[PDB]
């Protein structure tokens with residue numbers, strides 16, 4: 001219900017995967033749930049990451065230098081080596097007799113309970129790991145050693161600065177050394193990233209009641225403290241290690257900061273700090289669902305836990321960072337920031353708004369780089385990268401090595417230009433839910449005006465007045481180009497033209513409702529009447545391709561592509577969620593076929609809802625049949641293989657609108673339990689899937705739960721499945737708290753301030769602390 005628990009030894013990617021979901025974090029650090037006794041091998045990967053600390057490596061492959069920006073795995077401060085009677089204690093899979101590890105979401109504490117068989121008996125080892133969310137540079141470890149015998153025990157407490165980035169198997173072909181150890185002085189190890197000039201300072205102190213630890217000279221690039229004690233029979237020995245993490249990216253003088261931090265904290269403080277923090281968090285952040293799924297309530301909180309570990313205002317207010325695709329739990333995609341933000345930003349805005357503002361600063365700070373990125377590709381305005389990191393330049397590869405013939409080929413990954421519209425969408429959602437216009441003033445409006453310049457300039461008017469957007473990719477990554485050409489990008493992706501149509505609407509609204517701010521920023525950005533006139537005509541003339549039946553084509557010419565025999569590919573190969581790689585193995589190109597990795601055209605409904613999207617299509621002068629949603633959903637689900645974890649929940653929310661309750665609960669159960677169950681084996685070995693954690697919470701609260709906040713008002717239209725006996729949670733809207741209790745036939749809502757809301761489309765006035773029930 002509250003504790004994610006594992007019992008028994010796992011191996012390989014299954015062992016890495018548990019480590020990912022057991023990761024503890026506080027916005028500033030991500031600390032992988034690995035055993036304190038192990039280093040990187042086939043069943044273990046210790047990982048420590050800091051928000052925004054990247055390194056660039058250069059690896060020469062095929063006469064070309066491949067530059068990779070890697071989120072740095074810090075020196076491992078948790079390593080412990082034991083010794084009995086000067087004989088080393090071997091802790092591996094052949095000597096561990098009992099193993100259970102887990103994270104208690106109520107207090108944020110990681111435990112690992114081990115029993116090791118040693119030549120003289122059994123060693124019982126229980127580890128508590130914690131992170132301080134207030135003194136967010138602080139970590140601490142509680143280690144308890146017990147033996148059913150007596151011998152001389154020497155404990156070695158190590159900061160291991162010899163490790164590399166080795167979490168992702170396919171990344172090991174590249175240079176994986178990320179820093180040089182510049183000094184080891186007493187409690188402190190200092191490193192400096194090889195190419196980004198970041199000083200990394202890792203300091204630690206190890207104490208106990210019944211032994212003294214002393215810093216000793218150790219192996220190269222390892223800081224070592226050593227203590228000796230005589231184990232009495234069935235007598236527990238308790239050891240505390242206080243760790244302080246600091247880098248020059250967020251601190252002006254990181255060495256002296258770590259020094260004062262070690263001398264002004266304790267493991268107990270960290271434990272109680274994490275304890276008090278989560279107890280306070282769960283007063284409002286919990287989402288209580290009593291249903292016929294016994295595991296469902298745990299994974300809902302697991303989602304809430306990992307999203308709040310990835311970013312929390314008490315730490316992130318001091319940081320220049322956002323939430324990566326894996327948060328801070330692993331090295332999958334090298335910690336880069338994706339458009340995945342769209343899956344967490346509305347959650348942060350609705351339940352913890354200051355953290356949402358913190359991570360939107362990351363994009364606002366990087367408008368300049370986006371403007372530099374637009375020039376580099378011959379574009380205008382601000383064109384945000386597909387993969388952003390330290391500087392905001394494009395960190396996706398431009399070029400890829402063909403594996404059949406050994407020659408370089410263009411890489412089209414960056415052509416998913418719609419990532420610019422997600423950033424703009426995320427500022428709108430935040431502005432709508434919080435009412436904090438100070439973000440728009442401090443870059444948010446400039447970001448919108450500069451990205452609008454990128455879209456408006458890229459647009460092409462035809463002879464009959466229609467505007468087109470070419471050379472782009474939609475969210476369906478399976479389609480990078482038209483059949484026949486090497487030029488990347490397709491034309492008039494429906495998701496892009498619609499999202500862009502929305503952005504011009506919101507821009508034009510801001511010019512009226514926020515005239516003072518608008519004219520100021522438009523003057524500073526040279527957004528004159530010419531640009532504004534272009535925006536108005538593009539908002540009316542963007543082109544879409546819709547068939548006579550009402551099917552909105554994914555992009556122009558999509559109806560001409562070939563069909564795929566999905567049932568044949570399924571029976572032949574098994575799973576088709578990588579049908580793109582199956583097609584390429586047969587010498588076939590996914591560019592030629594009607595198959596979708598994830599929601600593309602239907603992703604507009606996730607962002608805006610079907611009513612908003614229908615209004616946009618009509619605004620563009622197109623007529624849709626009254627049942628276009630079901631038709632388009634049916635059309636595209638039949639072509640979608642769910643190659644991404646974010647695919648199914650978009651269909652789930654649509655199914656709620658269509659009252660397809662069986663499929664809606666099915667797809668949501670599938671998606672929310674992907675990381676937890678891991679029936680395939682190791683899908684989270686490279687990092688937890690943060691986006692699907694926020695996306696499934698959206699299905700629970702905004703689709704099933706039927707709560708919307710982004711449309712200028714609170715809209716309450718719950719549609720619960722019969723198996724969901726009770727759904728309760730809170731929401732934040734412009735400083736007002738809202739509490740909800742929902743059953744399959746009634747909703748109860750209370751606001752701690754006066755609020756005019758809508759319930760099933762009917763206007764309702766809420767009085768402060770006076771709940772109402774709607775059956």
Ligand SMILES: O=P(O)(O)O[C@@H]1O[C@H](CO)[C@@H](O)[C@H](O)[C@H]1O
Nearest residue numbers: 325338339340477597643644645
């Ligand atoms: O290729 P996968 O890892 O299966 O899914 C991809 O992951 C990206 C980052 O998480 C995300 O932005 C893409 O939409 C998604 O297709």
Ligand SMILES: [Mg+2]
Nearest residue numbers: 217218219220
């Ligand atoms: Mg030495």
